[PDB]
Write a protein that binds this ligand. Sequence first.
Ligand SMILES: Cc1cc2nc3c(=O)[nH]c(=O)nc-3n(C[C@H](O)[C@H](O)[C@H](O)COP(=O)(O)O)c2cc1C
Ligand SMILES: [Cl-]
Ligand SMILES: [Co+2]
Ligand SMILES: [Mg+2]
Length: 116
Amino acid sequence: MEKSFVITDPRLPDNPIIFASDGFLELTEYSREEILGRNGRFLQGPETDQATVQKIQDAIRDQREITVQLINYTKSGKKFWNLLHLQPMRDQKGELQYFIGVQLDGEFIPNPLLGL
Ligand SMILES: Cc1cc2nc3c(=O)[nH]c(=O)nc-3n(C[C@H](O)[C@H](O)[C@H](O)COP(=O)(O)O)c2cc1C
Ligand SMILES: [Cl-]
Ligand SMILES: [Co+2]
Ligand SMILES: [Mg+2]
């Protein structure tokens, strides 16, 4: 598929998605009109490890890059493992301007090892 990614605007409330790539539409099954303006957490669901979600929340707070592997769900409810790479984007003034999150679909690290 084409690269899956979204770009959020942390200068707006709760880091809304302001751009979603064609690859993200394909991976997630959502239309661009269903995605724009919401927070990336909408892909989570019952099996998502809340401890991983907290690591993401702390990375966003600290404006630090992180990679995690977590369960996400397509529009039709299909589970997928998401190796999610989040990167803060700063402008030439040193100010946070975006986050970008790149999704790679696959159980890259086996779940028995992820669990620790
Ligand atoms: C650019 C960007 C992309 C994100 N993409 C995803 C994603 O693909 N899947 C997901 O589960 N969370 C994704 N998130 C994480 C959530 O948006 C959120 O930061 C996380 O769930 C932690 O915050 P919370 O505890 O308030 O939900 C993304 C966040 C950012 C900033
Ligand atoms: Cl966020
Ligand atoms: Co591809
Ligand atoms: Mg939550």
